[PDB]
Design an enzyme around this catalytic site. Structure first.
Site, mmCIF file in Angstrom:
data_model
loop_
_atom_site.group_PDB
_atom_site.id
_atom_site.type_symbol
_atom_site.label_atom_id
_atom_site.label_comp_id
_atom_site.label_asym_id
_atom_site.label_seq_id
_atom_site.Cartn_x
_atom_site.Cartn_y
_atom_site.Cartn_z
ATOM 1 N N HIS A 20 -11.604 40.803 34.611
ATOM 2 C CA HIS A 20 -10.164 40.851 34.834
ATOM 3 C C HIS A 20 -9.816 40.492 36.274
ATOM 4 C CE1 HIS A 20 -6.086 42.156 33.740
ATOM 5 N NE2 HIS A 20 -6.023 42.766 34.912
ATOM 6 N N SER A 53 -1.945 39.620 34.610
ATOM 7 C CA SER A 53 -1.868 40.956 34.010
ATOM 8 C C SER A 53 -0.447 41.528 34.037
ATOM 9 C CB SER A 53 -2.898 41.888 34.668
ATOM 10 O OG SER A 53 -2.340 42.701 35.665
ATOM 11 N N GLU A 92 -12.349 41.023 30.150
ATOM 12 C CA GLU A 92 -11.138 41.704 30.603
ATOM 13 C C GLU A 92 -11.347 43.183 30.874
ATOM 14 O OE1 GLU A 92 -8.534 40.403 31.454
ATOM 15 O OE2 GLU A 92 -8.379 38.499 30.375
HETATM 16 C C1 LIG Z 1 -2.994 58.705 36.263
HETATM 17 C C2 LIG Z 1 -3.783 57.386 36.492
HETATM 18 C C3 LIG Z 1 -2.896 56.167 36.855
HETATM 19 C C4 LIG Z 1 -3.611 54.817 36.786
HETATM 20 N N1 LIG Z 1 -2.841 53.724 37.493
HETATM 21 C C5 LIG Z 1 -3.487 52.381 37.212
HETATM 22 C C6 LIG Z 1 -2.473 51.226 37.456
HETATM 23 C C7 LIG Z 1 -3.061 49.857 37.181
HETATM 24 C C8 LIG Z 1 -3.605 48.995 38.152
HETATM 25 N N2 LIG Z 1 -4.056 47.839 37.544
HETATM 26 C C9 LIG Z 1 -3.828 47.916 36.142
HETATM 27 C C10 LIG Z 1 -4.127 46.983 35.117
HETATM 28 C C11 LIG Z 1 -3.763 47.330 33.790
HETATM 29 C C12 LIG Z 1 -3.130 48.576 33.485
HETATM 30 C C13 LIG Z 1 -2.865 49.487 34.543
HETATM 31 C C14 LIG Z 1 -3.206 49.163 35.901
HETATM 32 C C15 LIG Z 1 -4.724 52.245 38.172
HETATM 33 O O1 LIG Z 1 -4.599 52.459 39.379
HETATM 34 N N3 LIG Z 1 -5.992 51.865 37.617
HETATM 35 C C16 LIG Z 1 -7.178 51.710 38.433
HETATM 36 C C17 LIG Z 1 -7.962 50.416 37.945
HETATM 37 C C18 LIG Z 1 -7.417 49.019 38.451
HETATM 38 C C19 LIG Z 1 -7.168 49.064 39.970
HETATM 39 C C20 LIG Z 1 -6.714 47.742 40.603
HETATM 40 C C21 LIG Z 1 -7.856 46.828 41.015
HETATM 41 N N4 LIG Z 1 -8.502 45.992 39.865
HETATM 42 C C22 LIG Z 1 -8.366 44.415 40.097
HETATM 43 C C23 LIG Z 1 -6.966 43.791 39.848
HETATM 44 C C24 LIG Z 1 -6.788 42.867 38.802
HETATM 45 C C25 LIG Z 1 -5.536 42.280 38.550
HETATM 46 C C26 LIG Z 1 -4.414 42.582 39.345
HETATM 47 C C27 LIG Z 1 -4.581 43.498 40.403
HETATM 48 C C28 LIG Z 1 -5.833 44.090 40.643
HETATM 49 C C29 LIG Z 1 -7.983 46.470 38.483
HETATM 50 C C30 LIG Z 1 -8.434 47.899 38.122
#
Ligand SMILES: CCCCN[C@@H](Cc1c[nH]c2ccccc12)C(=O)NCC[C@H]1CCCN(Cc2ccccc2)CC1
Ligand SMILES: *[C@@H]1O[C@H](CO[C@@]2(C)OC[C@@H](O)[C@H](O)[C@@H]2O)[C@@H](O[C@@H]2O[C@H](CO)[C@@H](O)[C@H](O)[C@H]2NC(C)=O)[C@H](O)[C@H]1NC(C)=O
Ligand SMILES: *[C@@H]1O[C@H](CO)[C@@H](O[C@@H]2O[C@H](CO)[C@@H](O)[C@H](O)[C@H]2NC(C)=O)[C@H](O)[C@H]1NC(C)=O
Ligand SMILES: *[C@@H]1O[C@H](CO[C@@H]2O[C@@H](C)[C@@H](O)[C@@H](O)[C@@H]2O)[C@@H](O)[C@H](O)[C@H]1NC(C)=O
Ligand SMILES: *[C@@H]1O[C@H](CO[C@@H]2O[C@@H](C)[C@@H](O)[C@@H](O)[C@@H]2O)[C@@H](O)[C@H](O)[C@H]1NC(C)=O
Ligand SMILES: *[C@@H]1O[C@H](CO)[C@@H](O)[C@H](O)[C@H]1NC(C)=O
Ligand SMILES: *[C@@H]1O[C@H](CO)[C@@H](O)[C@H](O)[C@H]1NC(C)=O
Ligand SMILES: [Cl-]
Length: 527
Positions: free
Chosen positions: A436, A196, A323
């Protein structure tokens, strides 16, 4: 017990027992002067010689970052949070080399994702010891600064130029260039891979001229720089940091005086105001991310892509079948990891407003139009599956396909895969599908640990995947030659062939999500 002499000093490693064999781990080697004090926000600075033997026997500090808190005690989310002390002092890296030491092995360099806001190389699913063992490649991963401390930008101003996290990455790549020979690695056969936001980082290292000589090949897992979340505009970047300046009382007239005002603030107060800077955030929002800084990135990447301004080499690119579902339970109404999240037409509509906040009323209606034409009426999963496809197709699958078309159009070999196996140890419910981030463990060869409760089909698939990635790394061609594995055809612009990865069929298909993505990549970008 094994000491490798590096260009900056001696380092003592550590020996691991892996599958009746041995891998040598060098965990936590620094690759930069710590970016503290006056160095915060600035480009990574060179590291001056040490006299002793550095002990690279434990993961080092993860860079500062906000933690995912939406599911306390739930492995499916917490497996992604740092498993290591946070600290601004975090520019370190890891090296897994096979034992006995190789003569000169292909090096695989991992760049973790996490929206550019989160992530760490320490994570369990980024363990390179299996790859070092099973394929005798050297695996390198690095910690790079994320969120505001890594990507806050007043473009032009060297106190905060932007892209510092990318420069962290790049200076680690420079370290593998000057040093991996001592570990028995071949600096001339280096394959970057990431997932990603890490995948988008890898794609930007293809554009950036200062990285062209630091690697050979590129693997892009569920991400690419042309994805809508990948680049924050120079407008957004400025409005984002001024918002941060207001919220910490560092609003000034003089730009540089703003910067050193945010430099006596502590990591915690900077970390906590970062969330409020996004005018209308989404689960996909990049608070502080890649910008066209004129240094790492000399023009807008979609023009560098469109006019062939990138490193010429082979790419391996791919995406997972679902995804988009991971993000649905981080804000979309009616959704839940704990029930099957059947939603209605009106909840779907409300979900578009949540993922497309500043998008036109007619734009949102256009999404509803192309994605609400069911084969059939009463299937109540229709709206639930549709919003996952919308977020997936728009944010990952179609930027990736578009990146691969335009990249192959300049004569280079490209391979596209469609990962569609749901892990049988997957902590999230089954409506979420092939999620994803959950090919990563298969790429790293975890299902090869017979003890870790993966089924035998999984162990086989991971073994095949691991052979394909290593062959791509070593030979620019991701075939599994020895067993009768499906040949992986190159992706060309006319025919657009891709390989599907799963437990049963490794089948060759064409023109993945074609109708969905004429919509996203060619009608929607105008609304
Ligand atoms: C004002 C709000 C701010 C939001 N700021 C995002 C940053 C971000 C993290 N990831 C992302 C993936 C794609 C795009 C953006 C982002 C955020 O915090 N979004 C919450 C959802 C994600 C949290 C992480 C855990 N999940 C699993 C994962 C998969 C691949 C790599 C790392 C982690 C993904 C959902
Ligand atoms: C699926 O769950 C959501 C949300 O909720 C659950 C599982 O988690 C949060 C708890 O506080 C809830 O009690 C529940 O156990 C359901 O969405 C809710 O629906 C309510 C109507 O009954 C609304 O008043 C709420 O606003 C709404 N909340 C959210 C966060 O969406 C949803 O109805 C459930 N769907 C199914 C099919 O079970
Ligand atoms: C490791 O493998 C590389 C090949 O990838 C060898 O690199 C050679 O380096 C010499 C140095 O002058 C060059 O003249 C050759 O052109 C390189 N080879 C190729 C194929 O480009 C290297 O010799 C190998 N062995 C080591 C480093 O001990
Ligand atoms: C670095 O590490 C040195 C080695 O300690 C021992 O190394 C091997 C032989 C194992 O037995 C291991 O369990 C031991 O800890 C230390 O002697 C040295 O003090 C360390 N130096 C620093 C600066 O950390
Ligand atoms: C940052 O931007 C916020 C939103 O501004 C509005 O939306 C953006 C996308 C543009 O269309 C802009 O013209 C609009 O005004 C503002 O509310 C906020 O005040 C801005 N912050 C600073 C410090 O300028
Ligand atoms: C802001 O302050 C710095 C102090 O280091 C000074 O050099 C600079 O000239 C000031 N800005 C402008 C626009 O003059
Ligand atoms: C190929 O077949 C053998 C048969 O035992 C199996 O053990 C191996 O894991 C398979 N895959 C390879 C070698 O990539
Ligand atoms: Cl390990």
């Amino acid at each position: 017990d094994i000491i490798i002499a590096t260009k900056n000093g001696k380092v003592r490693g550590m020996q691991l027992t892996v599958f009746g064999g041995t891998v040598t781990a060098f965990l936590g080697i620094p690759y930069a002067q710590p970016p503290l004090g006056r160095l915060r926000f600035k480009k990574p600075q060179s590291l001056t010689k040490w006299s002793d033997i550095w002990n690279a026997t434990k993961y080092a500090n993860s860079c500062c970052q906000n933690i995912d808190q939406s599911f306390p005690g739930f492995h499916g989310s917490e497996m992604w949070n740092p498993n290591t002390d946070l600290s601004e002092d975090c520019l370190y890296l890891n090296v897994w080399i096979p034992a006995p030491k190789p003569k000169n092995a292909t090096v695989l360099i991992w760049i973790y994702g996490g929206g550019f806001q989160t992530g760490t190389s320490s994570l369990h699913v980024y363990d390179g010891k299996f790859l070092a063992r099973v394929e005798r490649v050297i695996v390198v991963s690095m910690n790079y600064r994320v969120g505001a401390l890594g990507f806050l930008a007043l473009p032009g101003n060297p106190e905060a130029p932007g892209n510092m996290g990318l420069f962290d990455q790049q200076l680690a790549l420079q370290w593998v260039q000057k040093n991996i020979a001592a570990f028995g690695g071949n600096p001339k056969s280096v394959t970057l891979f990431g997932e990603s936001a890490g995948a988008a980082s890898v794609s930007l290292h293809l554009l950036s001229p200062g990285s062209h000589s630091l690697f050979t090949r590129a693997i892009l897992q569920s991400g690419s720089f042309n994805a809508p979340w990948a680049v924050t505009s120079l407008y957004e970047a400025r409005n984002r940091t001024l918002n941060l300046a207001k919220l910490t009382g560092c609003s000034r007239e003089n730009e540089t005086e703003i910067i050193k005002c945010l430099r006596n603030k502590d990591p915690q107060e900077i970390l906590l105001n970062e969330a409020f800077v996004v005018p209308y955030g989404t689960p996909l929002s990049v608070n502080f991310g890649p910008t066209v800084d004129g240094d790492f990135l000399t023009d807008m990447p979609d023009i560098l892509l469109e006019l062939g301004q990138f490193k010429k080499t082979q790419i391996l690119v791919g995406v997972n079948k679902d995804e988009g579902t991971a993000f649905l339970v981080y804000g979309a109404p009616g959704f839940s990891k704990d029930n099957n999240s059947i939603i209605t037409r009106k909840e779907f509509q409300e979900g578009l407003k949540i993922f497309f906040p500043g998008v036109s009323e007619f734009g949102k209606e256009s999404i509803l139009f192309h994605y609400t034409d069911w084969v059939d009426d009463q299937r109540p999963e229709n709206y639930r599956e549709a919003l996952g496809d919308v977020v997936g197709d728009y944010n990952f699958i179609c930027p990736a396909l578009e990146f691969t078309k335009k990249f192959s159009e300049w004569g280079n070999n490209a391979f596209f895969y469609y990962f569609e196996h749901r892990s049988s140890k997957l902590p999230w419910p089954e409506w979420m599908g092939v999620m994803h981030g959950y090919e990563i463990e298969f790429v790293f060869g975890l299902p090869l640990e017979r003890r870790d409760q993966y089924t035998k089909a999984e162990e086989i698939l991971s073994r095949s995947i691991v052979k394909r990635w290593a062959n791509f790394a070593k030979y620019g061609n991701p075939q599994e030659t020895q067993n009768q594995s499906t040949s992986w055809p190159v992706f060309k612009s006319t025919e657009q062939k891709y390989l599907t990865l799963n437990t049963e069929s490794t089948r060759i298909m064409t023109k993945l999500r074609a109708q969905q993505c004429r919509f996203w990549t060619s009608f929607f970008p105008k609304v």
